Amino acid sequence: RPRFSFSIAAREGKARTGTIEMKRGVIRTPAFMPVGTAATVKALKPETVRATGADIILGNTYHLMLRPGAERIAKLGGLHSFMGWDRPILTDSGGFQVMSQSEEGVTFKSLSPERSIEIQHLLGSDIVMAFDECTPYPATPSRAASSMERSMRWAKRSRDAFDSRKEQAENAALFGIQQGSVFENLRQQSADALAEIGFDGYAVGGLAGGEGQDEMFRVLDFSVPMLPDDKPHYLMGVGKPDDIVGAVERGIDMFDGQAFTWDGPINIRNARFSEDLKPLDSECHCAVCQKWSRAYIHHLIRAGEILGAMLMTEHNIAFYQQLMQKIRDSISEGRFSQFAQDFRARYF
Amino acid sequence: RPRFSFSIAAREGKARTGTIEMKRGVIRTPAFMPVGTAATVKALKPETVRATGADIILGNTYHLMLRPGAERIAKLGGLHSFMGWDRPILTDSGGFQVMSQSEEGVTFKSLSPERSIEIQHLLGSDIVMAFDECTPYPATPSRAASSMERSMRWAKRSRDAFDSRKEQAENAALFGIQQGSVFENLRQQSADALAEIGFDGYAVGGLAGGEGQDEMFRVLDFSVPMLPDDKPHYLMGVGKPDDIVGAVERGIDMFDGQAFTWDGPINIRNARFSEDLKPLDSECHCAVCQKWSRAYIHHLIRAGEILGAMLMTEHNIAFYQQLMQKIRDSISEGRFSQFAQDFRARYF
Ligand SMILES: NCc1c[nH]c2nc(N)[nH]c(=O)c12
Ligand SMILES: NCc1c[nH]c2nc(N)[nH]c(=O)c12
Ligand SMILES: [Zn+2]
Ligand SMILES: [Zn+2]
């Protein structure tokens, strides 16, 4: 395999399906990435994560740098070896979680473009995120501009740091992050700036920050076409099943007691499930739905048992992976419009 | 398979190895039973429990009767179906955890011989424990006598309740519990009384209550020979690896951050493990020791991650099952004395 090769196999309107080939594996797109916080996808062994269909997981730089530490993970062989996941890992830059300051970077109590890229290198990340400056929502045009401009300066710094490390440049990929809040002109300037520097993929940053779905979709309508068509488009911090379907309709390729079902989410703790022998979802192919009832999982979660968390998480990630598979198949078959309509009529 | 058949394949001194055949499976003895509290072995799927080598698990009547409830579990198909474990289950009587009162039974804020046997029936238990009255440690001779006598009256009541339920009598087994504190004469009276009523197996109750290993072993020295030789001997609430080895030497067949190793326990949270790439134990065949380091599990437990609990528990139960296997093989091969000596020299 190559370091990085993104190929589009099929399109329907703005939606695309294809593959990212990397040294550690192939990523099917549109892709959903389970999140590893502190070097573990919560309550799952890596083999269980894989069994759900995930091709790639996300690691959080902010949390790993604090515990157990980036240099320590490198001394132990890198993140993949440490946690036992041998396929691609995307690492965020750490910037977001710092927020949830100067032109050089940020200092905080328990980072810079250069230090973020270095930490991601020490972890052994396959997809490295440029270090950006968070724009809160809402933001005035002046402040959104100032932060976007700083982020573009930091994108160049991130590029140059990554490139100046040969092993990283040869084995990993680097994604840039579009900023600009909800403002079309600022999104355009940001896309232009990122394309001029050149990245392996382009994230839409700054959304899912409190603006609501209608507004997010409005911004995606004009923002995703600004990005290079031939590279992956990553919507950071999204999301809910319906958000994913609408974002794919707008050209996004990658994403990162409540149980998901094709009729909508349920809260398994509710008393109505105490004697319900049905699986969490009636069609779901996951191992949880094959073997255990709603009634048992209700009991486990209300009892605070670890197995409850294990079973709920495996089901939910499997559900998301089945969603992504149905999206990929429908786009490849030229019936994604109908899938999205059918999905919404029932989920709601 | 029969309802119940215990066969002794080999002996060495007081130690025995053999099998209990039941409708749901064969139990290899000496046996270690993982404990299911609130219908789950903590942090493990049933298939993982089985993969460690366990033949049988323990269910706690006190906890199940409170949450989710005995009648509810019966309505849902019984404990085996509810939790997804299809092999034998031993249920305790509920009496111990009530303590941790009258001749009819006990009332408490969140049971009788008859109600305990009924709850165990509603759960679908394969091995049912008679309902006894707990003797604290230390206990005076008068009080130990009074409680033992009450327990023997309750053993007869337990017998008669079990027998008067045809489905239970035909498909499950009933074990009696020897009491008498640390007093040889009271242990003798209790053994005699239980043998006269007749049970499928005999537990040594009332130990591991604060008396310490030397005292426990002294009591086992005279108490286990009093029980019928041709039935299983169950030491309730024991225990530590060294306690198990010495108890098997005295004729026991069944048992119910710290990681066990053949060099002794370690506390994985200790800083000395933060960069230790070795598995938890150097010889252990379990999946955890095949795949993850001490350093990773150190991190997970110190971070409060659920996967830490999952991995530690799987290793520890696998360790116990490997111990039991090495005990069974050494007795069958007539080298258990040497095993016990070798085990202690290294564990300590
Ligand atoms: N939802 C937006 C978001 C989530 N995580 C992020 N991490 C970074 N670096 N930038 C971003 O804009 C975001
Ligand atoms: N360690 C003694 C013990 C543990 N659990 C028990 N449950 C019952 N019914 N009786 C007992 O003596 C014990
Ligand atoms: Zn499922
Ligand atoms: Zn192990």
Side-chain angles (χ1 to χ4, degrees), chain B residues 231-239 241-257 259-265:
Chain B
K231 301 303 179 172
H233 308 333
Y234 171 25
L235 181 59
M236 301 184 82
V238 177
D242 40 316
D243 292 344
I244 293 171
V245 174
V248 169
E249 288 178 300
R250 289 166 173 82
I252 300 298
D253 310 302
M254 297 170 66
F255 299 93
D256 75 87
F260 292 92
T261 79
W262 294 110
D263 303 291

mmCIF file of all heavy atoms in Angstrom, chain B residues 231-265, unseen atoms left out:
data_model
loop_
_atom_site.group_PDB
_atom_site.id
_atom_site.type_symbol
_atom_site.label_atom_id
_atom_site.label_comp_id
_atom_site.label_asym_id
_atom_site.label_seq_id
_atom_site.Cartn_x
_atom_site.Cartn_y
_atom_site.Cartn_z
ATOM 1 N N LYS B 231 -19.459 -37.446 48.112
ATOM 2 C CA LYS B 231 -20.144 -36.263 47.615
ATOM 3 C C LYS B 231 -19.177 -35.074 47.577
ATOM 4 O O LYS B 231 -18.188 -35.085 48.326
ATOM 5 C CB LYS B 231 -21.368 -35.938 48.447
ATOM 6 C CG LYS B 231 -22.426 -37.014 48.530
ATOM 7 C CD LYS B 231 -22.939 -37.441 47.158
ATOM 8 C CE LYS B 231 -23.982 -38.537 47.436
ATOM 9 N NZ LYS B 231 -24.775 -39.006 46.324
ATOM 10 N N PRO B 232 -19.417 -34.087 46.710
ATOM 11 C CA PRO B 232 -18.567 -32.924 46.674
ATOM 12 C C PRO B 232 -18.586 -32.142 48.002
ATOM 13 O O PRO B 232 -19.584 -32.065 48.689
ATOM 14 C CB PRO B 232 -19.198 -32.021 45.586
ATOM 15 C CG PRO B 232 -19.987 -32.961 44.747
ATOM 16 C CD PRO B 232 -20.465 -34.039 45.680
ATOM 17 N N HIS B 233 -17.417 -31.541 48.263
ATOM 18 C CA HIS B 233 -17.158 -30.704 49.425
ATOM 19 C C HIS B 233 -16.874 -29.302 48.952
ATOM 20 O O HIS B 233 -15.916 -29.051 48.197
ATOM 21 C CB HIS B 233 -15.982 -31.249 50.206
ATOM 22 C CG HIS B 233 -16.079 -32.702 50.572
ATOM 23 N ND1 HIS B 233 -17.137 -33.473 50.771
ATOM 24 C CD2 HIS B 233 -14.975 -33.502 50.755
ATOM 25 C CE1 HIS B 233 -16.737 -34.713 51.075
ATOM 26 N NE2 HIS B 233 -15.420 -34.748 51.077
ATOM 27 N N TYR B 234 -17.690 -28.321 49.350
ATOM 28 C CA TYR B 234 -17.643 -26.955 48.854
ATOM 29 C C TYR B 234 -17.236 -26.027 49.983
ATOM 30 O O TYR B 234 -18.003 -25.892 50.958
ATOM 31 C CB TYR B 234 -19.029 -26.612 48.275
ATOM 32 C CG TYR B 234 -19.311 -25.194 47.889
ATOM 33 C CD1 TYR B 234 -18.366 -24.255 47.536
ATOM 34 C CD2 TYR B 234 -20.636 -24.750 47.833
ATOM 35 C CE1 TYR B 234 -18.673 -22.962 47.187
ATOM 36 C CE2 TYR B 234 -20.976 -23.462 47.505
ATOM 37 C CZ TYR B 234 -19.981 -22.565 47.178
ATOM 38 O OH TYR B 234 -20.321 -21.280 46.833
ATOM 39 N N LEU B 235 -16.117 -25.341 49.861
ATOM 40 C CA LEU B 235 -15.710 -24.355 50.874
ATOM 41 C C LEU B 235 -16.171 -22.974 50.417
ATOM 42 O O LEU B 235 -15.665 -22.399 49.461
ATOM 43 C CB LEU B 235 -14.205 -24.392 51.068
ATOM 44 C CG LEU B 235 -13.676 -23.426 52.130
ATOM 45 C CD1 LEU B 235 -14.274 -23.664 53.509
ATOM 46 C CD2 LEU B 235 -12.160 -23.554 52.218
ATOM 47 N N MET B 236 -17.188 -22.481 51.108
ATOM 48 C CA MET B 236 -17.839 -21.252 50.731
ATOM 49 C C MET B 236 -16.994 -20.016 51.064
ATOM 50 O O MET B 236 -16.516 -19.883 52.170
ATOM 51 C CB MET B 236 -19.214 -21.142 51.410
ATOM 52 C CG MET B 236 -20.122 -22.321 51.025
ATOM 53 S SD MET B 236 -21.791 -22.203 51.680
ATOM 54 C CE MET B 236 -22.513 -21.116 50.463
ATOM 55 N N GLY B 237 -16.859 -19.097 50.137
ATOM 56 C CA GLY B 237 -16.223 -17.819 50.392
ATOM 57 C C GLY B 237 -14.714 -17.882 50.449
ATOM 58 O O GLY B 237 -14.131 -16.995 51.056
ATOM 59 N N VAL B 238 -14.079 -18.874 49.880
ATOM 60 C CA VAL B 238 -12.636 -19.055 49.771
ATOM 61 C C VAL B 238 -12.256 -19.314 48.322
ATOM 62 O O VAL B 238 -12.887 -20.139 47.635
ATOM 63 C CB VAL B 238 -12.198 -20.261 50.636
ATOM 64 C CG1 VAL B 238 -10.710 -20.540 50.514
ATOM 65 C CG2 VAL B 238 -12.565 -20.040 52.097
ATOM 66 N N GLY B 239 -11.295 -18.707 47.650
ATOM 67 C CA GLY B 239 -10.500 -17.671 48.195
ATOM 68 C C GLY B 239 -9.226 -17.376 47.395
ATOM 69 O O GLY B 239 -9.089 -17.479 46.189
ATOM 70 N N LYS B 240 -8.255 -16.983 48.177
ATOM 71 C CA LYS B 240 -6.924 -16.698 47.727
ATOM 72 C C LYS B 240 -6.268 -17.971 47.183
ATOM 73 O O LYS B 240 -6.571 -19.066 47.678
ATOM 74 C CB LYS B 240 -6.074 -16.155 48.868
ATOM 75 N N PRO B 241 -5.384 -17.864 46.182
ATOM 76 C CA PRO B 241 -4.683 -19.042 45.633
ATOM 77 C C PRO B 241 -4.110 -19.976 46.679
ATOM 78 O O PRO B 241 -4.335 -21.210 46.600
ATOM 79 C CB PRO B 241 -3.633 -18.415 44.703
ATOM 80 C CG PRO B 241 -4.387 -17.201 44.193
ATOM 81 C CD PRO B 241 -5.076 -16.641 45.424
ATOM 82 N N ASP B 242 -3.379 -19.484 47.672
ATOM 83 C CA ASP B 242 -2.814 -20.324 48.718
ATOM 84 C C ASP B 242 -3.872 -21.011 49.593
ATOM 85 O O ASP B 242 -3.690 -22.164 50.022
ATOM 86 C CB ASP B 242 -1.831 -19.453 49.508
ATOM 87 C CG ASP B 242 -2.235 -18.012 49.785
ATOM 88 O OD1 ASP B 242 -2.766 -17.151 48.989
ATOM 89 O OD2 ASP B 242 -1.977 -17.655 50.979
ATOM 90 N N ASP B 243 -4.986 -20.317 49.837
ATOM 91 C CA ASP B 243 -6.080 -20.916 50.580
ATOM 92 C C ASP B 243 -6.668 -22.097 49.781
ATOM 93 O O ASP B 243 -6.966 -23.124 50.374
ATOM 94 C CB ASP B 243 -7.179 -19.930 50.858
ATOM 95 C CG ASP B 243 -6.802 -18.829 51.821
ATOM 96 O OD1 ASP B 243 -5.782 -18.953 52.528
ATOM 97 O OD2 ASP B 243 -7.530 -17.839 51.820
ATOM 98 N N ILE B 244 -6.813 -21.926 48.475
ATOM 99 C CA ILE B 244 -7.347 -22.976 47.612
ATOM 100 C C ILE B 244 -6.449 -24.201 47.635
ATOM 101 O O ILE B 244 -6.908 -25.306 47.849
ATOM 102 C CB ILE B 244 -7.537 -22.460 46.177
ATOM 103 C CG1 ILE B 244 -8.650 -21.393 46.130
ATOM 104 C CG2 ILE B 244 -7.822 -23.589 45.227
ATOM 105 C CD1 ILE B 244 -8.704 -20.712 44.776
ATOM 106 N N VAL B 245 -5.136 -24.031 47.461
ATOM 107 C CA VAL B 245 -4.220 -25.160 47.459
ATOM 108 C C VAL B 245 -4.311 -25.911 48.787
ATOM 109 O O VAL B 245 -4.439 -27.133 48.797
ATOM 110 C CB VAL B 245 -2.784 -24.711 47.135
ATOM 111 C CG1 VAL B 245 -1.789 -25.864 47.285
ATOM 112 C CG2 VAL B 245 -2.665 -24.156 45.724
ATOM 113 N N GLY B 246 -4.238 -25.207 49.902
ATOM 114 C CA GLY B 246 -4.321 -25.909 51.192
ATOM 115 C C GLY B 246 -5.641 -26.547 51.470
ATOM 116 O O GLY B 246 -5.716 -27.602 52.107
ATOM 117 N N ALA B 247 -6.738 -25.927 51.021
ATOM 118 C CA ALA B 247 -8.066 -26.506 51.163
ATOM 119 C C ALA B 247 -8.209 -27.755 50.297
ATOM 120 O O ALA B 247 -8.812 -28.737 50.772
ATOM 121 C CB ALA B 247 -9.116 -25.473 50.824
ATOM 122 N N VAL B 248 -7.662 -27.792 49.078
ATOM 123 C CA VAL B 248 -7.712 -29.030 48.305
ATOM 124 C C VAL B 248 -6.929 -30.136 49.004
ATOM 125 O O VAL B 248 -7.350 -31.302 49.020
ATOM 126 C CB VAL B 248 -7.183 -28.742 46.886
ATOM 127 C CG1 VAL B 248 -6.973 -30.055 46.135
ATOM 128 C CG2 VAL B 248 -8.144 -27.846 46.117
ATOM 129 N N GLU B 249 -5.780 -29.815 49.617
ATOM 130 C CA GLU B 249 -4.979 -30.747 50.399
ATOM 131 C C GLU B 249 -5.792 -31.319 51.536
ATOM 132 O O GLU B 249 -5.413 -32.374 52.062
ATOM 133 C CB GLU B 249 -3.716 -30.038 50.936
ATOM 134 C CG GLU B 249 -2.638 -29.696 49.939
ATOM 135 C CD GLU B 249 -1.469 -28.961 50.558
ATOM 136 O OE1 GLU B 249 -1.646 -27.868 51.119
ATOM 137 O OE2 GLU B 249 -0.350 -29.488 50.478
ATOM 138 N N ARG B 250 -6.881 -30.637 51.931
ATOM 139 C CA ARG B 250 -7.703 -31.077 53.045
ATOM 140 C C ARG B 250 -9.040 -31.646 52.592
ATOM 141 O O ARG B 250 -9.905 -31.904 53.437
ATOM 142 C CB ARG B 250 -7.825 -29.898 54.014
ATOM 143 C CG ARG B 250 -6.496 -29.644 54.725
ATOM 144 C CD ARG B 250 -6.466 -28.288 55.433
ATOM 145 N NE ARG B 250 -5.252 -28.123 56.235
ATOM 146 C CZ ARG B 250 -4.088 -27.727 55.709
ATOM 147 N NH1 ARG B 250 -3.949 -27.475 54.420
ATOM 148 N NH2 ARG B 250 -3.020 -27.605 56.501
ATOM 149 N N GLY B 251 -9.232 -31.830 51.282
ATOM 150 C CA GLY B 251 -10.378 -32.522 50.755
ATOM 151 C C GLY B 251 -11.519 -31.692 50.207
ATOM 152 O O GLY B 251 -12.601 -32.182 49.949
ATOM 153 N N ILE B 252 -11.226 -30.400 49.928
ATOM 154 C CA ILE B 252 -12.232 -29.583 49.279
ATOM 155 C C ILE B 252 -12.199 -29.713 47.768
ATOM 156 O O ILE B 252 -11.125 -29.773 47.138
ATOM 157 C CB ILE B 252 -12.087 -28.091 49.690
ATOM 158 C CG1 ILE B 252 -12.247 -27.895 51.203
ATOM 159 C CG2 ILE B 252 -12.994 -27.179 48.907
ATOM 160 C CD1 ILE B 252 -13.605 -28.280 51.758
ATOM 161 N N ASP B 253 -13.385 -29.696 47.176
ATOM 162 C CA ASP B 253 -13.642 -29.870 45.749
ATOM 163 C C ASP B 253 -14.124 -28.639 44.999
ATOM 164 O O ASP B 253 -14.029 -28.633 43.758
ATOM 165 C CB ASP B 253 -14.672 -30.971 45.529
ATOM 166 C CG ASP B 253 -14.349 -32.254 46.263
ATOM 167 O OD1 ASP B 253 -13.244 -32.835 46.038
ATOM 168 O OD2 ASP B 253 -15.198 -32.701 47.072
ATOM 169 N N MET B 254 -14.659 -27.649 45.689
ATOM 170 C CA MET B 254 -15.264 -26.507 45.036
ATOM 171 C C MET B 254 -15.017 -25.209 45.811
ATOM 172 O O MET B 254 -15.040 -25.271 47.059
ATOM 173 C CB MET B 254 -16.793 -26.715 44.924
ATOM 174 C CG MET B 254 -17.222 -27.863 44.083
ATOM 175 S SD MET B 254 -18.986 -28.270 44.172
ATOM 176 C CE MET B 254 -19.653 -26.792 43.422
ATOM 177 N N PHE B 255 -14.845 -24.126 45.101
ATOM 178 C CA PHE B 255 -14.497 -22.813 45.598
ATOM 179 C C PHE B 255 -15.224 -21.727 44.852
ATOM 180 O O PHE B 255 -15.574 -21.898 43.680
ATOM 181 C CB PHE B 255 -13.003 -22.573 45.380
ATOM 182 C CG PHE B 255 -12.140 -23.572 46.106
ATOM 183 C CD1 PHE B 255 -11.712 -24.731 45.448
ATOM 184 C CD2 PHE B 255 -11.771 -23.384 47.417
ATOM 185 C CE1 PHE B 255 -10.906 -25.629 46.143
ATOM 186 C CE2 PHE B 255 -10.959 -24.269 48.132
ATOM 187 C CZ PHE B 255 -10.550 -25.413 47.458
ATOM 188 N N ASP B 256 -15.440 -20.582 45.502
ATOM 189 C CA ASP B 256 -15.951 -19.363 44.923
ATOM 190 C C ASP B 256 -15.142 -18.209 45.494
ATOM 191 O O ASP B 256 -13.912 -18.194 45.510
ATOM 192 C CB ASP B 256 -17.454 -19.171 45.132
ATOM 193 C CG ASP B 256 -17.813 -18.765 46.521
ATOM 194 O OD1 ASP B 256 -17.793 -17.531 46.788
ATOM 195 O OD2 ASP B 256 -18.133 -19.580 47.386
ATOM 196 N N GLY B 257 -6.913 -3.153 41.030
ATOM 197 C CA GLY B 257 -5.540 -3.163 40.603
ATOM 198 C C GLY B 257 -4.724 -4.410 40.860
ATOM 199 O O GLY B 257 -3.603 -4.543 40.357
ATOM 200 N N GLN B 258 -5.247 -5.365 41.620
ATOM 201 C CA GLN B 258 -4.488 -6.569 41.986
ATOM 202 C C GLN B 258 -4.533 -7.598 40.871
ATOM 203 O O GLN B 258 -5.633 -8.035 40.507
ATOM 204 C CB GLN B 258 -5.052 -7.108 43.286
ATOM 205 N N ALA B 259 -3.398 -8.019 40.337
ATOM 206 C CA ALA B 259 -3.287 -9.071 39.331
ATOM 207 C C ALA B 259 -2.545 -10.261 39.905
ATOM 208 O O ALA B 259 -1.497 -10.094 40.506
ATOM 209 C CB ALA B 259 -2.540 -8.564 38.097
ATOM 210 N N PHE B 260 -3.094 -11.453 39.729
ATOM 211 C CA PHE B 260 -2.398 -12.658 40.199
ATOM 212 C C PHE B 260 -1.299 -13.111 39.243
ATOM 213 O O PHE B 260 -1.460 -13.037 38.024
ATOM 214 C CB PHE B 260 -3.447 -13.752 40.475
ATOM 215 C CG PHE B 260 -4.302 -13.372 41.667
ATOM 216 C CD1 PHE B 260 -5.487 -12.677 41.542
ATOM 217 C CD2 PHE B 260 -3.902 -13.652 42.950
ATOM 218 C CE1 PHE B 260 -6.236 -12.312 42.655
ATOM 219 C CE2 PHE B 260 -4.626 -13.282 44.064
ATOM 220 C CZ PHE B 260 -5.798 -12.583 43.924
ATOM 221 N N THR B 261 -0.177 -13.535 39.794
ATOM 222 C CA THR B 261 0.915 -14.093 39.020
ATOM 223 C C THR B 261 1.461 -15.276 39.816
ATOM 224 O O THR B 261 1.211 -15.396 41.024
ATOM 225 C CB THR B 261 2.053 -13.114 38.703
ATOM 226 O OG1 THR B 261 2.870 -13.008 39.864
ATOM 227 C CG2 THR B 261 1.565 -11.687 38.499
ATOM 228 N N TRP B 262 2.225 -16.138 39.183
ATOM 229 C CA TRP B 262 2.772 -17.316 39.846
ATOM 230 C C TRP B 262 3.868 -16.954 40.824
ATOM 231 O O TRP B 262 4.214 -17.765 41.678
ATOM 232 C CB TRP B 262 3.335 -18.317 38.812
ATOM 233 C CG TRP B 262 2.244 -18.882 37.976
ATOM 234 C CD1 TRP B 262 1.997 -18.652 36.663
ATOM 235 C CD2 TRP B 262 1.232 -19.784 38.466
ATOM 236 N NE1 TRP B 262 0.896 -19.362 36.295
ATOM 237 C CE2 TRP B 262 0.405 -20.051 37.363
ATOM 238 C CE3 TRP B 262 0.969 -20.360 39.716
ATOM 239 C CZ2 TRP B 262 -0.695 -20.907 37.509
ATOM 240 C CZ3 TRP B 262 -0.130 -21.205 39.830
ATOM 241 C CH2 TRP B 262 -0.928 -21.454 38.704
ATOM 242 N N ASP B 263 4.464 -15.787 40.743
ATOM 243 C CA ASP B 263 5.324 -15.158 41.751
ATOM 244 C C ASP B 263 4.593 -14.342 42.791
ATOM 245 O O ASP B 263 5.231 -13.600 43.564
ATOM 246 C CB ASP B 263 6.308 -14.281 40.955
ATOM 247 C CG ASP B 263 7.059 -15.165 39.958
ATOM 248 O OD1 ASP B 263 7.892 -16.007 40.408
ATOM 249 O OD2 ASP B 263 6.821 -14.984 38.742
ATOM 250 N N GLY B 264 3.247 -14.402 42.890
ATOM 251 C CA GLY B 264 2.530 -13.621 43.857
ATOM 252 C C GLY B 264 1.738 -12.500 43.213
ATOM 253 O O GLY B 264 1.972 -12.146 42.058
ATOM 254 N N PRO B 265 0.816 -11.926 43.958
ATOM 255 C CA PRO B 265 0.042 -10.821 43.356
ATOM 256 C C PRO B 265 0.892 -9.577 43.148
ATOM 257 O O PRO B 265 1.829 -9.314 43.914
ATOM 258 C CB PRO B 265 -1.052 -10.566 44.388
ATOM 259 C CG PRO B 265 -0.509 -11.108 45.666
ATOM 260 C CD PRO B 265 0.468 -12.185 45.347
#
